[PDB]
Design a protein around this ligand. Sequence first.
Ligand SMILES: N[C@@H](Cc1ccc(O)c([N+](=O)[O-])c1)C(=O)O
Ligand SMILES: N[C@@H](Cc1ccc(O)c([N+](=O)[O-])c1)C(=O)O
Ligand code: NA
Ligand code: NA
Lengths: 312, 312
Amino acid sequence: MDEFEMIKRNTSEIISEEELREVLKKDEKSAHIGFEPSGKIHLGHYLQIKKMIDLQNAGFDIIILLADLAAYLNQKGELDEIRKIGDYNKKVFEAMGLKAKYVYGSEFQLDKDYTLNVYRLALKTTLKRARRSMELIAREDENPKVAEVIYPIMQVNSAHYRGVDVAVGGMEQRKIHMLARELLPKKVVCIHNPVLTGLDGEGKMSSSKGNFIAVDDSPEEIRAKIKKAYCPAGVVEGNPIMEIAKYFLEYPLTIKRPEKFGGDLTVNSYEELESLFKNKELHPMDLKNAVAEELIKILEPIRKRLLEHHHH
Amino acid sequence: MDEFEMIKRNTSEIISEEELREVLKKDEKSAHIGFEPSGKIHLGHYLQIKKMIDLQNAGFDIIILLADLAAYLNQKGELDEIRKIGDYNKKVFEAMGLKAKYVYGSEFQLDKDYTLNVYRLALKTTLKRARRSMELIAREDENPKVAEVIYPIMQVNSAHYRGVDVAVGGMEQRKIHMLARELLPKKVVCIHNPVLTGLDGEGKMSSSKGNFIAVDDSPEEIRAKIKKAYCPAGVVEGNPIMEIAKYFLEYPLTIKRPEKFGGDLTVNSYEELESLFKNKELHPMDLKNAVAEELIKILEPIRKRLLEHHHH
Ligand SMILES: N[C@@H](Cc1ccc(O)c([N+](=O)[O-])c1)C(=O)O
Ligand SMILES: N[C@@H](Cc1ccc(O)c([N+](=O)[O-])c1)C(=O)O
Ligand code: NA
Ligand code: NA
């Protein structure tokens, strides 16, 4: 498995593979992702940081944009408070092992030259296109604000202004990114990560829907959340427990089971696990027990580095 | 006729008269109007400059905003070219006798603090409200751009940032101004001037519709435009020739007529003229002849000051 395949593993799409292969040849290459600061950092965040770590191991310089001004435009509160949550998010990302440079959007997004570029992009971007690009990002609002359509053209310009070769985000970002590839003179390579399902199966995982596992959740909290989660026997699509097994667990995986239910089970890949589960040879309760315990172990170093700050 | 009545003469509305009366007491008071730079300066412009002259004679300091960045957002071209047309407009306004200070929007509208205020207003302004406020201003576009809804919140902030007591414009501006009175901490007094009808009677006078008299039109051009204009006998509403008589001509007015059509006629007010015209005692051709000749005389000093620049 080469650098390209390491980077591609567990992504939903790369726009485009040819372009990424051209980028990989260079000595100096940079990748960025932006996050609206979030009160809790969850598995969806961690999935994306893992991908940034992959890029870093492939020789990319990594920039994490703490997207305070975007969050402001998307009604997350006052800038100063948003920034404070951004600094907390930085500490969490650092506790995940990421080696990166961190920047706050507002440090450069209010510059005269940046704003003139935003207004130039505003002339090229239809309202209808801008609204469509925000459908999976915008805060729910019965009376959508002008701020909602400034946000996407802020994010288009972000990638241009900073000279990144690669932009990374979730599939929710893909329409903004396709606008960026259409309007900017240098085409940014876009790597999109899958969107995790919420624990109750009812929609996508998100910080505002309370349907997530946070990286610093206690072991007892993780077990409780997994025990209650949607996980129907034999169904893999939209199954959040199988998603965690695919995206976070290491293989070969040993699933402990009582002898009366078949005894311990060693699975050499996620793909073998999917077969066992679809063929009803693995029961949800046993999948859940293994996923909970292996996830606790995966997150333990992150939680204890954040716990050391308090001191024990 | 006091200062308040001089200011009110020939306006469509003052929001509000009480507030204007409070402003009139102060020693230091300022009024501004903004114009997207226009290749031709026409009677609609002149109507508004006349009102600014009224304010100046009432002790207001006058600021003329050459609204280059607004024009840019409203698809009038590149900033540098727009600015050049702005400097031409300044020379025309100066040739009208206005004593004022001139500022280009872009000189202050790209400042960090200005932009942060725009984004704060964008959070308070619905898309639906912003689009409604632009219906009579926005350039025709089958695919309206994000720039269209940035424009109104640029103009709201303009009045705030510069600390004007009074904003002046045409009735087309009134929805943006009512947004400004609703969102800003200091309520700006708004003076709205009527919108002139186009020469062919079919819509409002505007630079893009080629339905105007320009202040530097030749005498032969003015006569030709008036001769062809909509002017039905006995009808005053939507009659552009009667509008010119109301808003530009001085009274008492002597209308020269052949003896066979009643001989010369002296009218002591626009209101007496309206009665004569509605009662079919004054024929369109004779109204047109008087309006053309008195308008030529009114504009002659403006045209010859602009002609002196060439040199004769
Ligand atoms: N859209 C991202 C935030 C973001 C990503 C990348 C960006 O460049 C910017 N930005 O420019 O403000 C913002 C989110 O949903 O969290
Ligand atoms: N809306 C005006 C132009 C204008 C007036 C006042 C203003 O403050 C600004 N502005 O802020 O750019 C622009 C027009 O139709 O010509
Ligand atoms: Na090298
Ligand atoms: Na005094």
